[PDB]
Structure formats: C-alpha cells, structure tokens
Design an enzyme around this catalytic site. Structure first.
Site, mmCIF file in Angstrom:
data_model
loop_
_atom_site.group_PDB
_atom_site.id
_atom_site.type_symbol
_atom_site.label_atom_id
_atom_site.label_comp_id
_atom_site.label_asym_id
_atom_site.label_seq_id
_atom_site.Cartn_x
_atom_site.Cartn_y
_atom_site.Cartn_z
ATOM 1 N N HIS B 58 -44.282 0.201 71.610
ATOM 2 C CA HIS B 58 -45.650 -0.129 71.210
ATOM 3 C C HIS B 58 -45.727 -1.305 70.249
ATOM 4 O O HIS B 58 -45.427 -1.169 69.059
ATOM 5 C CB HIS B 58 -46.279 1.123 70.556
ATOM 6 C CG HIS B 58 -47.743 1.009 70.247
ATOM 7 N ND1 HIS B 58 -48.648 1.984 70.609
ATOM 8 C CD2 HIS B 58 -48.447 0.077 69.561
ATOM 9 C CE1 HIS B 58 -49.848 1.658 70.157
ATOM 10 N NE2 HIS B 58 -49.755 0.505 69.517
ATOM 11 N N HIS B 60 -48.061 -5.267 69.546
ATOM 12 C CA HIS B 60 -49.168 -6.140 69.947
ATOM 13 C C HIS B 60 -48.698 -7.598 69.856
ATOM 14 O O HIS B 60 -48.772 -8.235 68.803
ATOM 15 C CB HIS B 60 -50.387 -5.904 69.049
ATOM 16 C CG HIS B 60 -50.971 -4.529 69.176
ATOM 17 N ND1 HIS B 60 -52.100 -4.258 69.920
ATOM 18 C CD2 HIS B 60 -50.563 -3.339 68.672
ATOM 19 C CE1 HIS B 60 -52.363 -2.964 69.867
ATOM 20 N NE2 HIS B 60 -51.443 -2.380 69.116
ATOM 21 N N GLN B 153 -59.558 -2.925 73.344
ATOM 22 C CA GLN B 153 -59.654 -2.759 71.895
ATOM 23 C C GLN B 153 -61.005 -2.362 71.334
ATOM 24 O O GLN B 153 -61.064 -1.610 70.358
ATOM 25 C CB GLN B 153 -59.149 -4.038 71.192
ATOM 26 C CG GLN B 153 -59.286 -4.044 69.660
ATOM 27 C CD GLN B 153 -58.267 -3.168 68.942
ATOM 28 O OE1 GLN B 153 -57.192 -3.628 68.550
ATOM 29 N NE2 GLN B 153 -58.608 -1.894 68.760
ATOM 30 N N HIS B 211 -54.503 4.561 72.932
ATOM 31 C CA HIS B 211 -54.487 4.531 71.452
ATOM 32 C C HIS B 211 -55.351 5.781 71.228
ATOM 33 O O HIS B 211 -56.589 5.748 71.351
ATOM 34 C CB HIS B 211 -55.167 3.269 70.911
ATOM 35 C CG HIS B 211 -54.226 2.119 70.690
ATOM 36 N ND1 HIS B 211 -53.593 1.452 71.720
ATOM 37 C CD2 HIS B 211 -53.797 1.534 69.544
ATOM 38 C CE1 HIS B 211 -52.814 0.510 71.219
ATOM 39 N NE2 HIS B 211 -52.917 0.539 69.900
ATOM 40 N N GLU B 214 -56.369 7.671 66.525
ATOM 41 C CA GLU B 214 -55.741 6.939 65.407
ATOM 42 C C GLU B 214 -56.791 6.901 64.292
ATOM 43 O O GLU B 214 -57.418 5.870 64.023
ATOM 44 C CB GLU B 214 -55.333 5.507 65.814
ATOM 45 C CG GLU B 214 -54.496 4.824 64.718
ATOM 46 C CD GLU B 214 -54.211 3.353 64.964
ATOM 47 O OE1 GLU B 214 -54.689 2.800 65.979
ATOM 48 O OE2 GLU B 214 -53.498 2.735 64.133
ATOM 49 N N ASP B 310 -45.401 -1.356 66.302
ATOM 50 C CA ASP B 310 -46.834 -1.604 66.433
ATOM 51 C C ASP B 310 -47.258 -3.048 66.155
ATOM 52 O O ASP B 310 -47.711 -3.738 67.070
ATOM 53 C CB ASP B 310 -47.642 -0.623 65.563
ATOM 54 C CG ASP B 310 -49.089 -0.467 66.040
ATOM 55 O OD1 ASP B 310 -49.478 -1.093 67.055
ATOM 56 O OD2 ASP B 310 -49.840 0.306 65.407
ATOM 57 N N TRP B 316 -53.150 -5.635 61.171
ATOM 58 C CA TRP B 316 -52.819 -4.276 60.794
ATOM 59 C C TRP B 316 -51.488 -4.120 60.051
ATOM 60 O O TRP B 316 -51.163 -3.002 59.654
ATOM 61 C CB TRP B 316 -52.830 -3.395 62.050
ATOM 62 C CG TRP B 316 -54.144 -3.438 62.790
ATOM 63 C CD1 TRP B 316 -55.262 -2.690 62.530
ATOM 64 C CD2 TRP B 316 -54.493 -4.318 63.865
ATOM 65 N NE1 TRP B 316 -56.285 -3.054 63.378
ATOM 66 C CE2 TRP B 316 -55.839 -4.050 64.207
ATOM 67 C CE3 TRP B 316 -53.796 -5.310 64.577
ATOM 68 C CZ2 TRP B 316 -56.506 -4.740 65.232
ATOM 69 C CZ3 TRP B 316 -54.458 -5.997 65.596
ATOM 70 C CH2 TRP B 316 -55.803 -5.706 65.912
#
Ligand SMILES: O=C1NC=C(F)[C@H](O)N1
Ligand SMILES: O=C1NC=C(F)[C@H](O)N1
Ligand SMILES: [Fe+3]
Ligand SMILES: [Fe+3]
Lengths: 423, 423
Positions: B58, B60, B153, B211, B214, B310, B316
């Site tokens: 996982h 991005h 998203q 996702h 979360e 992630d 993030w």
C-alpha cells in the site's frame, strides 16, 4: 412620514450614519462626520445601534402559553414534553390557538422581531392549529412576516396517515416541510421520512426545516442525510436542520468528516439555547453535558448557524418573554463564545444568520430594501447583549410599529444619581 | 550468470541451505551440513538470511514527494490531508507524476522491494496521474511488478461522475478497484459504493482494495460489508481491506462477532503503522489512542494481515525512505508484538502475508518459482529488525539488481575496534 434615521451606529462600521427613507424603502445610506441635528421627519437613533429586525427562526406558536395544561412535564425531557403536548392537542380549538399565538406575537413585535418561523403540529387529522395559524399569518402580516412549518410531531411514517396529513398541510399553504427522524420508530423510517420530506418540498417548491437529531444519542446521524439530499438536489439555501443536539455527543473524527459535507451542502442550522440547556443532558447523572450543537465550530467553518427561542411557556419550556437578546445571552455562555469579538458579533446569530435560514429576500440595511429596521439604545453588539437592552424603536415600511421608553433607575446617595449600568 | 546461492539461512529452518538456479528460476533447494566454499557463479549469502522480496502492499506513488506543495497538512489529519492533496492534484502534469513515482520506486528497488501496489487518485476527470502511472508500470517492470489501484479518493457516489471515472480507470488498465466508504457523504452511500465496487471487480475480473474505516469512529463498520460481499461472491483471496483503523475503537463483543466473518471470508488486511500512528488519535486530547487495526488478534486468529508504508513525503506523511523493516519496527512497537518470537516472525508481515494480499502467483523460495530473492546480512528476522539492516543483495530473474556495501563503524579506544552492534 419619516424621511431619515440619523446618528446611527452600524455593526462592523466606524462612526455615525444617516439612513434616507423614501416610499417605504431605504433610498441611500451616508456616513456622517459628526452628530446631526434632529428635525421633523427624522428619527434620532441617538448614537444607538441600527440593525435589520430581529428574527425568530424557530418557535411553536400552536403550543405557546400552554405549560401545565392539563399536566406539567415533570421530567423536563423532549419525550415527556411530546406526551404532555398530545394531551393538550386533543383539547385544541380554533380560537384557543389564535388567541395564544397572538399573545406571543405581540411580545415579539414589542421585541423588534419582524420575521418569525413557527412550527405547527400536523400529526392531527383535524389540522385544527394549522387552520388557525393560517389565519393568524394573514392577520399579523402588517407587523410580522410569519412562515409556517408543517411539523409532523409524532412522525411521518410512525403516525397514522402521517405522510398524507403532511402533504395536506402543504396543500393548505404551509411554507415549509418539517420532519422529526429521531422520533420515528426505526432508523430506516427516519431515513425514509427524509426522502419523503425532500420529495414533497420539490413537488410544492417549499422550504425544509427538520427537527434533526434532537436527542443525546451519539448514533443519531440524520443530519448527514439532510445535508446529502440537499446537496444532491442543489437546494441547500432552502434547507434547515434544527437542533442537531446529538452533534454535541459525536466523536471528533466523524464530526470532522461530516463538516466537509455540511459546508458543501450549504444548509442552515438552528440552535435553541434556552430549551436545549433544559431538555438535553437529562439522562446523564454527573457530569452532565450541555447538549447544544457545535455552534462555535460551525462559525469557525463558515457554516450558517443561528439561534431560536423554540418555546414560550409550553410543554418544553416554562419561561420566556420571546426576547432574542436573552436567547443570545444563554447561547454565548453555554457555547463558550465569550471572547469580546465573539460576544460583539453575537447579534449576527439573531439577525443576518437567521434571515438566511428563512431564505429572506428583502433583509438588511441596504439601498433598495424595505425600510425595516430597529434601534437599540446601545453602542454595539457587546453593549446591547451585556445590558440586555430593549428595542427603542422598531420601524417597518418606514413607519414606527413599536417603541420602548427605557426604565429610569436612581440611587439616593449623598445626592441622587442616575444609573445606566454603562462604563 | 549466477548458478547458486550458498550459505543461506531460511526463516523457520535450522542450519544452512543452498539454492540452485537455472534459467532464471529456482531449480532446487538443498540443505548444507556446513559452510560451502565460494566460487564463480555462486552468490555467497555468508550465513545471512535469504527471503523472497520485500513487498509494499500500500503506497501512493501519485502523491509521493509532494509534502508542503502548495501547503502543509497542519493538523496532521486524514481530512486535511485530502484537502491539501486536492490543491496539489489541480497542478499535476504527466512528467511531474512520472518523475516523482520513479524517485520513490528507485528507493524501493534499493530496499529489496520487487512487488508494489500503488493507489492512484481517480477522482479527476483528466486522469492525469493514472495515465502517467500506467507508463511507469511498463517502464519499471524489469525491476518491480507494480499493481495500480483505481482509488476514488473523494468518493464514488459523493464526487461528480465518480462511478464513471472509476470504471474508465479499469478500462484503461488499473489492476485493482478501490473505494473509500467512510469518506462518502452518508452511511448509505458508503454501503452502496461497496456494492458498486464489487460489481465492477466481477465485471472486469480485477482485485479489490478498499480504504476501509480509516477513521476513529466506533460506528464506522464498512469492513463487515467488504467481508460479507467477498464471502457471497466466493472471492476473498482477491479482496483487501486497507487500514480498518476504526477497529481499534470497537467494543470487544462486536469485534468478536465480526472476527468469525473476517476469517470465513478469507479477505486480506493492510495496516500502515507509520501513517496510522501519525493520523489517528488526532481528535483525542489525553489519553490518546494508538489507532492501528487489531493486528495481534488477526495473527492469533489466522487472518491474513500485513504492513504498508502508505506515504513517502506527501500530504499524509512528512518522512520515509520506503524502508519496510522500518515500517515493521513501528508496527511491532505500536501493536505490542514485542515477544521474541513475535518480533522474529515479523518478517512475514512484510513478505509472505503481503504477497498473499497482492494475490501473487510466483512468490517464495521454492523450486519452480522465479529466482526472485533478497539477502539480509543478519541471522534471523529478529536480528534484521533489531539492527535495521540494509539489503545486501536483491536478485530478480537470477540476476543482481541491487546491492548495498554495509557501513563500516570504528571506535578508537586503546586500539581501534570494529563495531557491528551484534551480540
Ligand atoms: O420536537 C419538538 N417539539 C417541540 C419543541 F419545543 C422541541 O423543539 N422539539
Ligand atoms: O484516503 C487516504 N489517502 C492517502 C493516504 F495516505 C491515506 O492512506 N488515506
Ligand atoms: Fe421545536
Ligand atoms: Fe492509502
């Protein structure tokens, strides 16, 4: 007829201002560089604050003045309140409703309130109160623009013929469609009731005002459906979520996620401080939660929120004189909006923000608007709130419709001295 | 070309082993009774640990290397992160995305990662990042097998044309269907979005990676729908629930009931330790919850769970070198998997369990499999984790694609002494 309002202070503005009136409207607004002399046809604000009229975005005129009839709400809860109201609703008569509604409306006129949204219980096959209120609306029109919400107090899906009665109320002329999802028998009925409410509002081109999540239940999240349906239909400006007291009990993560939708949807929120502090927290022992929705955070996020009185001597509230500065005072304390600027800007919660909630099209001190304004004998919002000042003059259509000669207090010391509580 | 890997230690096995290579595959694995001599065409593991490649389940890659552009995520929350990303997404260009993705991919190759699943935001009518990533996938293929998740998203039902864009991303070649139910406007949209996600995965024969929950909301239970739909369709192996941080806040009774379904469904779980400890618990004051899903309990129940990084320097997460042993280190501490055996077995969370999550068909040190393996200069999983060792050699298709000459530390006491931090 009055031609000018002179020596006026305006919120957020420096100095004094003159408001010119013509044909019942405001023709122009000009700054003054000093104090203007009085003269015939000029109303002297005497350096007091001039604002558009106070607004009552949420009141129950069909239940007003009935506390204790035939029994009192002993527990001080929303639920027992509805049971006590049911007992009184069975005794309603046309004249009974008109007389009590008019009694409270006169207090409102005296308090500079020119716009009122009253909920009327339509969980009643006879629609007695609604028929009476529709006549009151016409009768009070010269002084107050009254909006009527068809409020299905006992539910839409949980009351016999609830949906048919709600629609009948709209066909008779109610201005706003109401709902009460947290009182429906099940969460599914709550969500479904909102789809039906929105469908009726679009079918009849009416506004929406939902008694939404008025309960200390962290799982009562009907507000997200109200906001999502409004966003989907592109009608946020026409939608209001009243109470949302459950939001006081939500965890912060869900609230943050929710706030994005609340802002995007453009819907309005009404908090009712006097009633919420009384009815919420009743199932806690100690500590006891306050139970008002997240007003401070809404203001910080640019979400429109405003204050209503809700009840005046009825099953849900044993007090009141229909005074908006008093409602504001309670809200600022309970919501901890106690910074100087927060208190001073408090007037927005009972004027402009409430006008937006009612979707008013002719409101505010601006050229072209009707000459509807009130004068407070105070220097600014902070001063008006601190001293709980009366409305010196209420002007509608360019004419005085109410006035209060202030009280005169004297203390007899070595010599008499006038006391005005100012600094 | 390399013909053998000698003097290799294998997790869970005693002694040393020899791995014979032929035609880019592992032809046989034989135990040694002692240390073998080096020779040409033999890669000496030097009694270090040989394992299949690290996996990043996982990440991005479309957002990597963008932290602070154009603004920083001040609150350190998921919600502000999405807002900051939205600002950056509006500035994307094809070359911008390819360059940043490749920068992080090179760090991953250096770190022995040969399998990567990247989410790509498809809540964008231009699908700029997706088009760039599809080219990167082809370009990096000799070194990394990259899976692309079409990640909506901003929601499927809560974003304009969200479902159409999600399907367009699959038609363009995305390998996995994503979703984000807890970010949808309502719980109903969240549940409905999952039915749509599963329908698309069955229509196109693709994997699913949601996702999921979360958020520190004890009422966010979308994971039960993900697991139930997977069970109904008999496709658990192809389904992954990423994050499930809300599970950290569930009551134990519901969690116990839920676990039966999680096990029966066969779906996979990804925890992202570095990001979860940073973004979760942000709405608590003190005490503050950790916010990682129930990794320890999943392992005890035989539910497949693994760890992802992630984010690498993005909205993030402001840190990272795309190092899986570092991700593992954080997860073992926060999840309290600190027993010797738990730490030693930790490597499974970044190797085998992650390969299962990606539904890999050619993974592991076994005869017949491609010769894809890495060598750690450590005695076992515990030692590798404690010393945060680099990847000495990464082998793919029987060829070395990365190597790290270890650092050399010396202390100058009465005489110089080499320090390796071993016991
Ligand atoms: O449901 C309700 N009925 C009457 C009230 F006063 C309160 O606003 N809520
Ligand atoms: O929704 C999300 N977007 C990006 C992240 F890094 C986090 O995994 N969650
Ligand atoms: Fe009410
Ligand atoms: Fe992610």
């Amino acid at each position: 007829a009055l031609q000018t309002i002179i020596n006026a202070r305006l919120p957020g503005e420096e100095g004094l201002w003159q408001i010119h009136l013509q044909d019942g409207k405001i023709s122009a607004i000009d700054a003054q560089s000093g104090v203007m002399p009085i003269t015939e046809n000029s109303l002297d604000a005497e350096q007091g604050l001039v604002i558009p009229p106070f607004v009552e975005p949420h009141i129950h005129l069909d239940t007003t003045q009935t506390a204790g009839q035939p029994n009192w709400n002993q527990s001080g809860t929303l639920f027992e309140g509805i049971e006590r109201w049911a007992e009184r609703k069975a005794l309603l008569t046309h004249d009974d409703v008109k007389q009590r509604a008019w009694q409270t409306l006169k207090w409102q006129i005296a308090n500079g309130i020119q716009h009122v949204r009253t909920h009327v219980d339509v969980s009643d096959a006879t629609l007695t109160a609604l028929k009476a209120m529709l006549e009151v609306k016409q009768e009070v029109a010269p002084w107050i623009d009254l909006q009527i919400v068809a409020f299905p107090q006992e539910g839409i899906l949980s009351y016999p013929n609830g949906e048919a009665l709600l629609e009948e109320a709209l066909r008779l002329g109610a201005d706003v469609v109401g709902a009460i999802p947290h009182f429906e028998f099940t969460r599914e009925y709550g969500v479904e009731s909102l789809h039906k409410t929105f469908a009726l509002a679009q079918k009849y081109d009416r506004l929406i005002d939902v008694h939404c999540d008025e309960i200390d239940d962290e799982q009562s999240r009907f507000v997200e459906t109200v906001a999502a349906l409004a966003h989907h239909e592109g009608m946020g400006a026409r939608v209001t979520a009243s109470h949302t007291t459950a939001m006081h009990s939500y965890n912060g993560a869900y609230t943050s996620r929710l706030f994005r939708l609340l802002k995007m949807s453009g819907i309005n929120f009404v908090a009712n401080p006097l009633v919420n502090i009384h009815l919420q927290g009743r199932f806690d022992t100690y500590p006891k939660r306050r139970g008002i929705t997240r007003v401070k955070e809404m203001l910080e996020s640019g979400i429109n929120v405003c204050f209503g009185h809700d009840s005046v001597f009825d099953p849900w509230y044993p007090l009141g004189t229909a005074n908006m500065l008093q409602v504001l005072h309670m809200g600022l304390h309970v919501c901890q909006l106690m910074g100087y600027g927060q208190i001073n800007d408090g007037l927005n919660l009972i004027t402009h923000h409430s006008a937006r909630t009612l979707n008013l099209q002719d409101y505010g001190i601006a050229a072209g608007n009707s000459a509807n304004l009130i004068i407070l004998p105070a220097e600014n919002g902070f001063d008006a709130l601190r001293r709980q000042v009366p409305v010196r003059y209420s002007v509608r259509g360019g004419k005085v419709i109410a006035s209060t000669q202030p009280a005169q207090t004297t203390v007899y010391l070595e010599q008499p001295e006038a006391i005005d509580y100012k600094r």
